[PDB]
Every structure is written in structure tokens, then in C-alpha cells.
Design a protein around this nucleic acid. Sequence first.
DNA 1: CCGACAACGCATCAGC
DNA 2: GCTGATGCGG
DNA 3: GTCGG
Length: 330
Amino acid sequence: APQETLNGGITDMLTELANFEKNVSQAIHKYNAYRKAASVIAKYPHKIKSGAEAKKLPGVGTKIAEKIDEFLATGKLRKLEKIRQDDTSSSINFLTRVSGIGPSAARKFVDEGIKTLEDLRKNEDKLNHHQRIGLKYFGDFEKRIPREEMLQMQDIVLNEVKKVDSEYIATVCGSFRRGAESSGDMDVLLTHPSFTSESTKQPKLLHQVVEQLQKVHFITDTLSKGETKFMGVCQLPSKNDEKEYPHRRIDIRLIPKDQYYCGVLYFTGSDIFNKNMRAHALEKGFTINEYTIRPLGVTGVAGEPLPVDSEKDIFDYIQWKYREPKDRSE
DNA sequence: CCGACAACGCATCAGC
DNA sequence: GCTGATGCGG
DNA sequence: GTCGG
Ligand code: NA
Ligand code: NA
């Protein structure tokens, strides 16, 4: 990927605009429009000389091209400069960095005078459970996770899961599975042969695992927990007289056996890869989502889901030699 | 011109 | 009390 | 905001 020095001023600009659209104007589609434009320019291996030049890239239109011209000519954007200094808007934008606080809650808080973390700290009674944990670990949640820590975390998870029931199958997905040097969180996909799409499974397969992870003091807090999905916080044990590890976000999903591998594939990504794969899949008469892979009739009537016992199976259906997670950047 | 821009689990709200 | 809608997240 | 039927 091109050095940020090439078009970093532009992409940063587009990303800041993206956040305000999402967090302040509550215009999610404009948020994604800017992100797409930022991503396209980010991978552009040429220092952009004009809006017309950028305009040629998919996702860059008349408005963004116009903004690029202003930025190239003045090193800034008047609209962005103004919004940054706006106390209400900047405060709303900022509060959304707290996990659990979205555009709606941030707007409500600022409306009543609650604009900073300090303010949040003084008003715990106005925060739900999720938001309280988000505040407590605000700093930790923004710190990334080195692969070495991700490995230690995986060791614990795989060990405790097998200890509960050796028939469980757990796979740590996300960028980590693709070999990333760092992660933003840990995503664990869990399944058990007793659990399939059309049958009960003693609705507690997930609970048993969470409970064990809390028992060895790995999982420290719970954001949400149901029969199929758990979202919480975890922390590796600290070393003798050594700086305790920061708290990390961990999600754990229980997926039916027959839908497991479609899930591993999907939650492994990358998003760009999943896009290119779902596309390549369609031109082959197939549609792949998070749960299954289904054919398509002469009209489109996607028949029942096809049997999958591994990732490779999915690749075979669409005649696409199985690609190692390591090579799934796109 | 104007609709799509994903579909979904959990926590919590809105309203009967 | 339950049902559906909304907020939030990844 | 951008795309495309
Ligand atoms: Na374009
Ligand atoms: Na947030």
C-alpha cells in the first residue's frame, strides 16, 4: 500500500468528514460514501494533483472532487475547519468513541451538558451497562493487540473450551487468522456436533464456555450474552511485578455445525476478499453469505443450502482453489 | 430522477 | 405483562 | 455522496 505521505491529507480529510456524517448528521450512507472514497484514494499509488484526477476513481464524485480542489489549493476545508471548532458537534463526535454510545446517545448527552469523559464519569446513573464498561475501558479498547498477545489469548481459549467438552470446535478468526501482526479484538467461532441447524442442543453450550472463561478469570466483563452470541471483555494474567495487560474486547459466537465453516470463512475476511469471493461466486451461479452457500435456479430461486464440512468445500463449489487465510487480503 | 447503500443478536425503549 | 421498534455493534 | 436502473 502507498505511503500515507502521498494522499494522507486527503484521506484524513475524507475520514473526518465520514465521522461527522455518521456521528453528528446521522447520515450513515454519506459516512460510507466518504469511507469508500477514502479507501479508494488510500490505495492510489500516485500523488493526486486535482479533483478531476480523483474523480476518475470509483466512489469519488463531483462533491468530493470539489473538496479535493479546495484542500489542494488551501491545505484545508472551510466546512471541516468550522465543524472541528464547533463545541456541540465535536463533543457529539467524540463521545461516540465510547463503546455503547452511538450517535443517538451522544446527541442526548451533549444536549444535557454531558460532553466529556469526565462528564460521563460524574453521571454513571445515566449510562447503561454497556456504556459503563465502555467508559471504564475507554483507553484499553482503543489500544491494539499484538499478535503475541493474541496467541496467548488463543491458547487460553482453546484450552478452556476443550476442557469443558473436548468435542467443541473453536476457531479464532478475524485478521488474526489471516496472520495479522496486530488485532483490534478477538473473535471466536464456537460449534459442537450436538448443535445443528434443525435440532436443539441443550441451549447452554455457549454459557458453559463463558462460565469457564470467567472461572479462570480470563473473561472480566459482559457487554451482552445470549444463547448464541457473547460480547465481552477479557485480560491475560499479569506477570510477576510486571505491567498488567490491558483489557481486550472478545466476542464468542455459537454457530450450528452445518453452518460453521461458512461462518469461519465470513468472519475471517478480509471484507474485500469476501466481496470478491461473493462476486466470483455469483458468476458461477452461487451466493455465499455468513451462514450458507446456495445454488440458483434459472430465475434465481436459490434452492436449499449446500452441504459444507470445511472451507475448501465452499471453494470447490465455485471452482476456486482453496486460498489460505494468509492470502485473503482481497 | 430517485432508490440502494446487508441482515441480524442482544439490550432496551415505546406503546398496548 | 408481552410485542414490536430502535440503538448499537462488528 | 455516489452509483446506476
Ligand atoms: Na468516480
Ligand atoms: Na460508540
